[PDB]
Design a protein around this ligand. Sequence first.
Ligand SMILES: CCCCCCCCCCCCCCCCC[C@@H](O)O[C@H](CO[C@H](O)CCCCCCCCCCCCCCC)COP(=O)(O)OCC[N+](C)(C)C
Ligand SMILES: CCCCCCCC/C=C\CCCCCCCC(=O)O[C@H](COC(=O)CCCCCCC/C=C/CCCCCCCC)COP(=O)(O)OCCN
Lengths: 129, 98, 99, 114, 347, 70, 105, 303, 83, 71
Amino acid sequence: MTMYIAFILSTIFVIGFVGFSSKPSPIYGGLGLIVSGGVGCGIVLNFGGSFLGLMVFLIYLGGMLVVFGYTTAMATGDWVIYDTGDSGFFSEEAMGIAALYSYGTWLVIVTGWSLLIGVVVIMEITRGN
Amino acid sequence: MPLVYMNIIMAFAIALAGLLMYRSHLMSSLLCLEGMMLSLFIMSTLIILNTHFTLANMMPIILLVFAACEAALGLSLLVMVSNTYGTDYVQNLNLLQC
Amino acid sequence: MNIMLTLLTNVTLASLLVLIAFWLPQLNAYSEKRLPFSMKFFLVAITFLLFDLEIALLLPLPWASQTNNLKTMLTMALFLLILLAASLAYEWTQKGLEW
Amino acid sequence: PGIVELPTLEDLKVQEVKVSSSVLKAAAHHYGAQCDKPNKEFMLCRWEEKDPRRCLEEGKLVNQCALDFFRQIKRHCAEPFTEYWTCIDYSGLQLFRHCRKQQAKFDECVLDKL
Amino acid sequence: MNPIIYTTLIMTVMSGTMLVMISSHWLLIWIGFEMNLLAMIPVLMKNFNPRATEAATKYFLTQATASMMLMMAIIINLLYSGQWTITKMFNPVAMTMMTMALAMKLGLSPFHFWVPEVTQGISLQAGLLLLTWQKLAPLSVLCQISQSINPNLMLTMAMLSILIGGWGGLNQTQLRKIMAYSSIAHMGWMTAVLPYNTTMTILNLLIYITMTLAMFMLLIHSSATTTLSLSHTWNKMPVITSLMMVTLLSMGGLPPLSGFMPKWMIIQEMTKNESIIMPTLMAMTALLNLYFYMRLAYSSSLTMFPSTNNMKMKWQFEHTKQMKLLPTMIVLSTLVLPMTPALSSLN
Amino acid sequence: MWFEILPGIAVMAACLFIPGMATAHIHKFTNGGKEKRVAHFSYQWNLMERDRRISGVNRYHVTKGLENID
Amino acid sequence: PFFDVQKRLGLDLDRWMTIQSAEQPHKIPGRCHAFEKEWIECAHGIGGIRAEKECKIEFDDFVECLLRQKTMKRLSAIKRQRDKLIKEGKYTPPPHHLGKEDPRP
Amino acid sequence: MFMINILSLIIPILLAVAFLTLVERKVLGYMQLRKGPNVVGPYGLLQPIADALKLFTKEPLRPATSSISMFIIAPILALSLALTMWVPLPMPYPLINMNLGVLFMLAMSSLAVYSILWSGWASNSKYALIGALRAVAQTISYEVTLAIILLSVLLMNGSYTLSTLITTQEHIWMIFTSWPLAMMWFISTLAETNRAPFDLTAGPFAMFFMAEYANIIMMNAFTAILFLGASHDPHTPELYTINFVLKTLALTITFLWIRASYPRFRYDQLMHLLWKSFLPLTLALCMWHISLPIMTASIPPQS
Amino acid sequence: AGRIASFLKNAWAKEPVLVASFAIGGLAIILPSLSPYTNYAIRINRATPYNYPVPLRDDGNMPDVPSHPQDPQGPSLEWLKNL
Amino acid sequence: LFQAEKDRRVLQMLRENLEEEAIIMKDVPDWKVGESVFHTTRWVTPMMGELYGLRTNEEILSATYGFIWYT
Ligand SMILES: CCCCCCCCCCCCCCCCC[C@@H](O)O[C@H](CO[C@H](O)CCCCCCCCCCCCCCC)COP(=O)(O)OCC[N+](C)(C)C
Ligand SMILES: CCCCCCCC/C=C\CCCCCCCC(=O)O[C@H](COC(=O)CCCCCCC/C=C/CCCCCCCC)COP(=O)(O)OCCN
């Protein structure tokens, strides 16, 4: 037991949320949120969620917080609850995620329509006049 | 219920409280919302992976997508508010009073 | 462990070599003597964010190709790409990609 | 709410198969061809009983069948099997496709002998 | 905006509400709420001005916070029971957080503060849509999970909503703020009967929606957003003022008007469950809503306020656009008391 | 002439030769003269764990041959 | 409120994702498949109220599988007593728990 | 011996980057009827060492008003990401064998823009901030099409594992299967690293320079692995290493050639290029490459 | 007839990228429904054994279920070898 | 063969843990050695902490994070 590494990861996550929850100098708040997102991604990756952790680290960090900082720039215990068996010759996470195209037709339809409406709504809101 | 889930929920509560404080900078409001969705993603992912709910692996991605879309909308709104005042201060939105 | 050690090594080497670069010329003594907020640049970032979300949706495609329900997955993947193209076309025709 | 029963340490003693995964992969096709009946009985009992404690004898039977299979290989086709599993062991993926020649030697040897 | 875009956004709002209403999976309910939230924002900003932008951003903030709380409640429920179906909540305060999220979505006290501001900022059509259609989905979810709710918290927030609406309506000269406080009080009346009978909640919702539609269409026809601006309507359209006064009396809960039907039934239902004090207090507090309705009626049609000279020119023109459903809405919000037992249709 | 560019390029080539080759040699030295075993999919990991236990020296690379079947 | 379109039309829009034991891809089982199966079978058609009073055993077993509070409590008690005896000095773990066992395939 | 492996990966890349500058100057000079540095050293071989020593012994001009925190952090992030993105690559065997290696590289490349943002915002100047905003917008714009092209190409590989790309191209290169995607990928990699014709924008400056040049070399190496598959024999990986290094050197020299051969775009011109020529073609070819294995019953194995 | 050809000829000039993209997308939509190898791909996906084949308990009334893998009855993969 | 070996190893580890619990809990008044926490008598797959709870830290780290940390 590496002194319950997940415990330290969770504590650092909470410390980061406390750090930018005071909201000092919103770029410093954003950087604290970047560190917190990195810590949470590390938590998910260490748990075993490689694909979902990489989704966090790519989408969240590289797109959403990047756009946040861009707009701001324009302005002024463990190891016990786990399993025993194996997964086969694949990862169950990848199979469940890829099931979105064979099982989740309804989810794909609603999410795609929502994203298209989001694009249209953004255009209308940012039209100005 | 292990301590990690409690830590994540405490993080979410801290983010929500910080959103409710409103020192200034509505951008910080959006930041608090995004911290809240990040905590939601992390804890939902941990719960789903742990119980081996294979079809539930869909849900976090969906959540992320939708939440990020919301952020975009919020950012747009912020710009227009700033586009009227030049700054994103909360107290500038005092025109409407109960 | 190995990935953590590799990241730690890379960060440590970069930090040490930056510090020595920043401190070697500091041992010798020398003289030691706005608003505009363009709106198109915001639309570029927002469009990038939306298209990145749709890419996130598209990502599980390499594993989606082994499901035995090939017709349905092909239909849904083509549907997602069609709506991505439709978003691009709508933003194009509404003068959203101009300078 | 009750006491869980576990078999004694003596009931779990069996002559174990002490060959590595490379040897097992090299012999796997003929092993499945020859040891099908005890393996199928064990797996049927395992999926129907849903209990490790109710399928202990069948594990001993499948171990015995594997040991007999390897004993026949050792008596008749030890050397070509040795080169075949050494080749399989070298590869980091343990791919069959890199030394079809050693596989052909081993397969013709076992076909001629047994 | 482009009429095609407006039609698409309205259809997206309605499709989000229908997705909430027809789905049995919590994630699909959250997705429907997200879709409705996304498509509602431009509708509030059809007329571009800083007031509408402020109202839209306030609404977006409140609704996004409510959605985050809803997701947290869903995830805690999943943690304590691996269920996604919308059923009994299966857990402690996870239900409390679900109730808080739905209360913020509906505008119940103590989360009532955003309703008057958003209603004042937006125009009359946007206010009509906001105060009528945006209540169906959260109320549907609450009706689905009604057996889970703790009666103490729900009844406390309902009584708070009634009290706050009654008191806050007394101080208003703007018509939109009056409508917002009326909505808050009516939602308070609606959610106090959820622990006992959801059919009564739905009946109150139908009656309130009819009355609100009639009131907003009458306000749009005589395009006034202020008490004094409304006081000039008699010099042009006295029949509009008379219909408005009758509708206001109906919204006050006076028998034999239609608006008396819900409260009556609700009170009746609450007496079957050995509850007396709360129905009494609710009636005595709705007296305040009646008072400010009656003040508006005094300023509208029972007295004739001074007019202006240019009004004469307005005498020579007729409304080009006519609302077809306005006559029906008035009759349904005024004269449907004798058809009360039809509530057995499980409306 | 143009071949005077070749020296520096050669240096680059040598610098780009070192990493990959090095890894291979290390993979030969740490994994007992064979290719390093890759473990995705959690079944190859089980195979490696079984190999580690059988050897008795707590190393997956050591291979127990038929000679150990008696 | 709830308009059960899926049952009227037989569409199955989102019922496939509601429970762990409903046709996972590649027949991958949930961690608590048996407990959830038992609890669902017991409570089918009984209704929520009678279901809540009468299927309490199966639901308690399902929750124990999901969160394992009792198992961790028992393990922690055993470990605490072991630590107490090993600090007092009257207990010595066998080589099996010290790393000196003979591992088996 | 994992520390030795990390060091033997990390040091030769830096040496390669130092010598790349000499090659870039030398290659360009001979392309312009002149020579590169040929005085400092036998053939300019000592020029990078003299450059490094002079840059490290030159005074650093700290803005005297900037945030020292981010001013120091930005080069750290740049170097860390540049050196980290080499870990996943298999030459033939990777330092770290990742299941989702390509996705990891995508995430790192997505992070790469924070250094630009922080350098611009800590520069304490409106004009440098405007330039940084332009650079960040261009980078995110082109990484969109990078990601789409990358997943379209990987649809024939069967996974995100980088090693499997060697097995996929054992008989034929990937360039023949899809050359248009390779063309757009090459242009997108040119535009990502702010290289001509897209180059619109003492110690820390050298740090950023080494980070950019290491990113250039890594991008060329990744392109060579992705589209020009080298045959790997398990019993002698040196042949694969030699072939991979030769192809990477050829691609880097091709970048130098393109820099030497063309004028530069305007900002709006490259924006239009991407958003109105690459994205539609990228989406169409993504649809084509989704449907193609299903039409031809040629789906890759791994799942 | 003539108007469509004129429009395509005008689009092939000064807008070739859009013409190529639309053609490729339309072909990607249309072709899979006409190819005969999509069923082959589905069958290939069906024949990939990811799980252990759990044996069936024999009752003497399954003439189509083999008792051993070498028995002739059961699904065959000769067609896949021929591919 | 792997399934049989897995079942045998898991059962043998559980037997060792039961023996150690019987030795340790001999003085605790209300303890019942090897008492199930479930009402059902059906076999339940043991957790990782049920097998490795009393064992040493290094092999706990192995069984928990070896596959995740193997690169
Ligand atoms: C009947 C109502 C029609 C009018 C009302 C429309 C209401 C809103 C529009 C959305 C409803 C469309 C119906 C789609 C429901 C999904 C379920 C159904 O389609 O079956 C699927 C069949 O998939 C079909 O391919 C669906 C194709 C239709 C979707 C493509 C276009 C959708 C656009 C609809 C509106 C979206 C926005 C507007 C775009 C113009 C499931 O596939 P299946 O293989 O059986 O089972 C998989 C499970 N397995 C693996 C265990 C076997
Ligand atoms: C449902 C099918 C989808 C699948 C294929 C498409 C996938 C991706 C392609 C679409 C991406 C989005 C494209 C957005 C289109 C916007 C068009 C537009 O508005 O631009 C017009 C120009 O667009 C047009 O020219 C109108 C249509 C032109 C032809 C479009 C294709 C129509 C059919 C052609 C091919 C038909 C099938 C192929 C057969 C050809 C023979 C092999 C103005 O250009 P500017 O840049 O503003 O110029 C100003 C500076 N001078």
